[PDB]
Amino acid sequence: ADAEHVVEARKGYFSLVALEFGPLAAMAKGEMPYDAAAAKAHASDLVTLTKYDPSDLYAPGTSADDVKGTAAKAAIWQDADGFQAKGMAFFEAVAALEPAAGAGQKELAAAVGKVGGTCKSCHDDFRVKR
Amino acid sequence: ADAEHVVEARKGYFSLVALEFGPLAAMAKGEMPYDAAAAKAHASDLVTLTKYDPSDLYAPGTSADDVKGTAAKAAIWQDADGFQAKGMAFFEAVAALEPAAGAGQKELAAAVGKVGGTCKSCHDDFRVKR
Numbered sequence: 001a002d003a004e005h006v007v008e009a010r011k012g013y014f015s016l017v018a019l020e021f022g023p024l025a026a027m028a029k030g031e032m033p034y035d036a037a038a039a040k041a042h043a044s045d046l047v048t049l050t051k052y053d054p055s056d057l058y059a060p061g062t063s064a065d066d067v068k069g070t071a072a073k074a075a076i077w078q079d080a081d082g083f084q085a086k087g088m089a090f091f092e093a094v095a096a097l098e099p100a101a102g103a104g105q106k107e108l109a110a111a112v113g114k115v116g117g118t119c120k121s122c123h124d125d126f127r128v129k130r
Numbered sequence: 131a132d133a134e135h136v137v138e139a140r141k142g143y144f145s146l147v148a149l150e151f152g153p154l155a156a157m158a159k160g161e162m163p164y165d166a167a168a169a170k171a172h173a174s175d176l177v178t179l180t181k182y183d184p185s186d187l188y189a190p191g192t193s194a195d196d197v198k199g200t201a202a203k204a205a206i207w208q209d210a211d212g213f214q215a216k217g218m219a220f221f222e223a224v225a226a227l228e229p230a231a232g233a234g235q236k237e238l239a240a241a242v243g244k245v246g247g248t249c250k251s252c253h254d255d256f257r258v259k260r
């Protein structure tokens with residue numbers, strides 16, 4: 001598709017991830033009361049998102065070196081193996097997030113912490129900083 | 131969280147739907163060669179998107195009457211029954227595209243036609259003509 005379109009989709013993808021992770025983080029932090037049903041609901045939605053195959057999102061020539069409006073580093077394409085590894089770590093942390101969701105604030109907080117680490121670890125090597 | 135993030139995720143969700151439907155429509159139009167594997171791949175991602183529960187995308191007070199940058203009509207919330215109806219029509223049509231996607235160009239075109247009808251049916255009633 002056109003580069004602009006791929007970029008819009010890629011950012012949209014992370015917008016959804018952020019939308020569903022947001023209330024889990026809020027609850028882990030104590031900003032928002034713990035609600036096990038709400039927690040499980042967001043958690044399961046996040047699992048669906050990780051099931052989606054994001055290949056089309058990473059069309060060659062759509063890095064920050066190529067088009068504006070994106071924060072995806074060229075590194076993503078030069079290190080396909082490091083990228084799938086950070087993706088896999090995320091997918092696994094999210095899987096663990098499900099059972100934890102309904103077992104208490106302290107457990108959800110622990111699980112959320114692991115997921116959060118995966119967000120950052122990816123950003124660190126593959127997202128431009130500003 | 132705030133309207134602006136709900137708005138970006140909703141638009142993001144449709145950007146992904148469009149990204150995956152795009153190659154299916156081009157193949158059906160004869161604008162790109164029929165490739166059964168690729169068709170199957172895009173179809174299956176579309177199925178995964180229809181599984182994502184979109185409830186959080188439709189937070190009250192996020193229609194075009196409320197915030198700028200959205201094309202979602204207040205009608206979505208006024209006619210929740212009819213909206214759900216349009217959504218299911220889309221869900222079902224997408225479910226029928228999967229097996230057809232790799233059965234041939236004519237089969238794929240017919241099925242993509244059905245899906246296409248659902249996109250526009252929902253847009254006619256619930257999306258601002260912008």
Ligand code: HEC
Nearest residue numbers: 010011014018021070071072086087090118119122126127
């Ligand atoms: C790598 C495999 C990543 C994982 C795991 C996470 N994110 Fe990330 N993200 C990644 C990239 C390459 C980008 C840039 C996208 C672009 O093209 O610019 C992002 C971006 C985001 C953003 C910004 C979205 C926007 O509107 O522009 C958010 C809010 C975001 N990411 C959040 C996020 C969270 C909450 C994660 C864990 C639950 C997470 N990401 C993981 C790469 C990767």
Ligand code: HEC
Nearest residue numbers: 140141144145148151200201202216217220248249252257
């Ligand atoms: C209702 C049940 C819909 C279905 C079925 C389809 N779409 Fe739609 N779409 C709908 C709404 C309410 C909106 C507005 C969202 C907003 O908040 O503005 C949209 C928007 C789009 C867009 C624009 C996305 C953007 O970046 O702003 C596209 C490209 C789009 N929709 C495509 C699309 C396709 C290809 C569909 C069928 C396969 C389809 N949509 C179905 C509502 C509904």
